[PDB]
mmCIF file of C-alpha atoms in Angstrom:
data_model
loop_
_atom_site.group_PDB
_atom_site.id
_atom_site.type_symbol
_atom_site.label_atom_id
_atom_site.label_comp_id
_atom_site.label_asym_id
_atom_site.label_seq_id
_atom_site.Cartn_x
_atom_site.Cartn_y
_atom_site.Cartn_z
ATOM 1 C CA UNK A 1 116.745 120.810 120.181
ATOM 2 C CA UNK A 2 118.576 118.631 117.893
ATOM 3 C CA UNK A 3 122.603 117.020 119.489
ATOM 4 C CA UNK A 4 125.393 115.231 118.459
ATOM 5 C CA UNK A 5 128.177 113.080 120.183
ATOM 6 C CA UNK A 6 131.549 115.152 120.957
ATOM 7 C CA UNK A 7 134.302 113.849 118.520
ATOM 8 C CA UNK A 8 138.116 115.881 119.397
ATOM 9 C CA UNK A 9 139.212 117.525 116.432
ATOM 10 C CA UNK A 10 135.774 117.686 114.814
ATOM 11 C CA UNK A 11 133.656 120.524 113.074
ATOM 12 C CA UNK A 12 129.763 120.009 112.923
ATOM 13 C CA UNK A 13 127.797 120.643 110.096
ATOM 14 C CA UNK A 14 124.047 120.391 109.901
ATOM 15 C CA UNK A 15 121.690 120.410 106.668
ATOM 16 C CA UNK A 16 118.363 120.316 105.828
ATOM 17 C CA UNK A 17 118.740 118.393 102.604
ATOM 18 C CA UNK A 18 120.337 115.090 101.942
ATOM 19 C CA UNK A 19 122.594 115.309 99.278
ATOM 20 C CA UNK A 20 124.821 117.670 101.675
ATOM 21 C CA UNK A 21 123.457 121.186 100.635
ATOM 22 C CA UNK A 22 121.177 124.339 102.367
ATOM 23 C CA UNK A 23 123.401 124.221 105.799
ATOM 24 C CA UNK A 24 121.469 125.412 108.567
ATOM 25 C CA UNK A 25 124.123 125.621 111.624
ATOM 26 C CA UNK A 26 127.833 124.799 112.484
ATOM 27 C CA UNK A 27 126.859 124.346 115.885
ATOM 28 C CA UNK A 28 127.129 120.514 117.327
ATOM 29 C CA UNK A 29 123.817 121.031 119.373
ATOM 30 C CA UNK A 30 121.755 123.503 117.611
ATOM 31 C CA UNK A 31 118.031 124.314 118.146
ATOM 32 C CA UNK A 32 114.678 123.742 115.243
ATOM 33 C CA UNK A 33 112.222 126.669 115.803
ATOM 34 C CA UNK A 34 108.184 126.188 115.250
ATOM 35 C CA UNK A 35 107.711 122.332 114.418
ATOM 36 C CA UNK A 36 104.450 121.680 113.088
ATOM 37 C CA UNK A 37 105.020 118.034 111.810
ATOM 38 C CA UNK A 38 108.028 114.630 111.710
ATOM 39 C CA UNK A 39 110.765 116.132 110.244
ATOM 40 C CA UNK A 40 114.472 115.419 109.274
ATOM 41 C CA UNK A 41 118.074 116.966 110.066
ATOM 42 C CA UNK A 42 121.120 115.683 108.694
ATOM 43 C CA UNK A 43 124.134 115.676 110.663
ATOM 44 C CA UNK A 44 127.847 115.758 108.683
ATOM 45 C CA UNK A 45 131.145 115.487 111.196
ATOM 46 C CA UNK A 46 134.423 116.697 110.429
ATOM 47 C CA UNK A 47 137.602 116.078 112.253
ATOM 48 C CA UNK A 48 141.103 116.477 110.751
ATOM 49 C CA UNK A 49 139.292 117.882 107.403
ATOM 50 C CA UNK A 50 137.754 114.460 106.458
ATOM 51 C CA UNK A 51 133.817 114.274 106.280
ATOM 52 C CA UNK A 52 131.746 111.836 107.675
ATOM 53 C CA UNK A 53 129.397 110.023 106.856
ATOM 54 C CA UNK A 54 126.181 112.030 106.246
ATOM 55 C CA UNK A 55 123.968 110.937 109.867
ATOM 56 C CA UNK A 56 119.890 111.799 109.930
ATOM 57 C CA UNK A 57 117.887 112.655 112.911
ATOM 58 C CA UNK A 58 114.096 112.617 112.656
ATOM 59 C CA UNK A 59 111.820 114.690 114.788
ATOM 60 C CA UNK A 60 108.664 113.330 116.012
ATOM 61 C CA UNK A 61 105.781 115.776 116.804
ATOM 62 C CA UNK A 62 103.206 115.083 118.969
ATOM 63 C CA UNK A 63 99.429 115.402 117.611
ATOM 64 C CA UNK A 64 97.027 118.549 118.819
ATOM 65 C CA UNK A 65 95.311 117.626 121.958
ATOM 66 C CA UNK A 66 91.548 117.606 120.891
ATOM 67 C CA UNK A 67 89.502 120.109 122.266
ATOM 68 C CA UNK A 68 88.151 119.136 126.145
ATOM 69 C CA UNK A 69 84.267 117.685 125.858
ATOM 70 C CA UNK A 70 81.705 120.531 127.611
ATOM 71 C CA UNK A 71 78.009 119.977 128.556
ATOM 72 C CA UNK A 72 76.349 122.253 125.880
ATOM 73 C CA UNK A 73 74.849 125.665 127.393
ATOM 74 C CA UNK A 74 72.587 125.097 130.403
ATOM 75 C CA UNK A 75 70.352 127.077 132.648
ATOM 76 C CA UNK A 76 69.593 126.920 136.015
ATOM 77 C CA UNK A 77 67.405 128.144 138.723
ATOM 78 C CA UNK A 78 68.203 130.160 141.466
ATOM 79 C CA UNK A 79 68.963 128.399 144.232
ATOM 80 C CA UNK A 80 69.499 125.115 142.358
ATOM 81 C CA UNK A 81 73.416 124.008 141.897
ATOM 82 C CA UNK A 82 75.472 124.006 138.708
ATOM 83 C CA UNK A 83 77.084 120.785 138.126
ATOM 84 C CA UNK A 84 80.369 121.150 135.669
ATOM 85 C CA UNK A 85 82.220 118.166 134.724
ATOM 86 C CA UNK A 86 84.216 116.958 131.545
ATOM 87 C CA UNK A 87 84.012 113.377 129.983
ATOM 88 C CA UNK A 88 87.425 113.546 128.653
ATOM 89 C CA UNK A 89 90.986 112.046 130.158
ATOM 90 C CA UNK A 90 93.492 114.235 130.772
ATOM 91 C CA UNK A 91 96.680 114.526 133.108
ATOM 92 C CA UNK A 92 95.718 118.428 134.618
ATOM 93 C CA UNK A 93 92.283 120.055 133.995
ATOM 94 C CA UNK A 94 92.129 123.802 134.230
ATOM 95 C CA UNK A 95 88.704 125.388 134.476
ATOM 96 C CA UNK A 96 87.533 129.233 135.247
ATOM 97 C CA UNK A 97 84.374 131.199 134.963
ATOM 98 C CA UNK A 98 82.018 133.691 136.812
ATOM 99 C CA UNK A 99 82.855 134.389 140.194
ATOM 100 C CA UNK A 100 85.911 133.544 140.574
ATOM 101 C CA UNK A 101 85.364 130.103 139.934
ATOM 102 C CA UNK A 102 88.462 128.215 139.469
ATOM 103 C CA UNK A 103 89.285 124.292 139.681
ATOM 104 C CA UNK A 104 91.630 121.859 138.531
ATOM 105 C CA UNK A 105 88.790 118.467 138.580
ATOM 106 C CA UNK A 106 87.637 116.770 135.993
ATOM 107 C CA UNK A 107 84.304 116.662 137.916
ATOM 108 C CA UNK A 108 84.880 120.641 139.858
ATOM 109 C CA UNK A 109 82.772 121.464 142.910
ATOM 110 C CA UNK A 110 78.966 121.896 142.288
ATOM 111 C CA UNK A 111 77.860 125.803 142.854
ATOM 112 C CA UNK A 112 75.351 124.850 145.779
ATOM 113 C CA UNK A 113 73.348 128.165 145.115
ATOM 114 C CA UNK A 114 73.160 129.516 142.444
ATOM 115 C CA UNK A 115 72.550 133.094 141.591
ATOM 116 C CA UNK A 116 73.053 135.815 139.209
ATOM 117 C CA UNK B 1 148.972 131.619 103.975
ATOM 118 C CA UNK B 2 146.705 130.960 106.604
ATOM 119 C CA UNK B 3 142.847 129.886 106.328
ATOM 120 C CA UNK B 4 139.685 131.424 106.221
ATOM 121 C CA UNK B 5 137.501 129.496 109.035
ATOM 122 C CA UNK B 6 134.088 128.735 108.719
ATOM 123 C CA UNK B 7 131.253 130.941 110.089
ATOM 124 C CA UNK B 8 130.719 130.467 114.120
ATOM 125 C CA UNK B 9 127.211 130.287 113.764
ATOM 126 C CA UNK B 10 126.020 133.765 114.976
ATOM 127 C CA UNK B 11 121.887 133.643 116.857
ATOM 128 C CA UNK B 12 120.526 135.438 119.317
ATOM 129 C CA UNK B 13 118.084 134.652 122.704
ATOM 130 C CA UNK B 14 114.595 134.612 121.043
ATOM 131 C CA UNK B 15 112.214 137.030 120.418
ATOM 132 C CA UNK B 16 112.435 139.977 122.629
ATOM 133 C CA UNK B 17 109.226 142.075 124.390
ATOM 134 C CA UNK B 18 109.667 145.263 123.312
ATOM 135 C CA UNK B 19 111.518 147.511 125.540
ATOM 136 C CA UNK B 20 113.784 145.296 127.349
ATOM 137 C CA UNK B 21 116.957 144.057 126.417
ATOM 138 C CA UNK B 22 118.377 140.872 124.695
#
């Protein structure tokens, strides 16, 4: 979502090119779909019929979380226990598999017995 | 003579599932 101040008597313009030209909205607080990288708004104000000057806004976009870090395929025995755990830092883990299992640990419950 | 006004900028509430309403 991209804002500007309120101003009485003023219009809002925005553009996605300096040099005042390809408008995008009249809104004051209008919304950017799908950002996939830093980009840059420009905001012109208009009260009374006289134009502002021309005001930027950048965007910052946060970088792809890397995938999570897995133990590569096992195999166990029956009746031994499967030990799951990730060695990456996060702020929620979400795991599921087989049997229902579900857990929200970066080191889950160990399967005590396993089976098929 | 009046003045032509600018365009309220016209949208919509995001994409819809098909079937329901918008």
């Amino acid at each position: 979502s991209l804002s500007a101040g309120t101003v009485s008597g003023a219009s809002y313009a925005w553009y996605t090119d300096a040099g005042t030209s390809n408008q995008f909205s009249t809104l004051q607080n209008p919304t950017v779909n799908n950002l996939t990288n830093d980009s840059t708004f420009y905001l012109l104000v208009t009260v009374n019929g006289c134009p502002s000057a021309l005001d930027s806004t950048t965007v910052v976009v946060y970088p792809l979380t890397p995938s999570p870090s897995l133990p590569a395929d096992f195999a166990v025995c029956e009746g031994d226990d499967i030990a799951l755990s990730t060695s990456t830092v996060a702020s929620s883990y979400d795991w599921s598999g087989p049997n229902g299992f579900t857990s929200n640990a970066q080191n889950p419950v160990v399967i005590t017995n396993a089976t098929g | 003579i009046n003045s032509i006004p600018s365009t309220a900028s016209a949208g919509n509430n995001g994409p819809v599932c098909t079937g329901t309403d918008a």
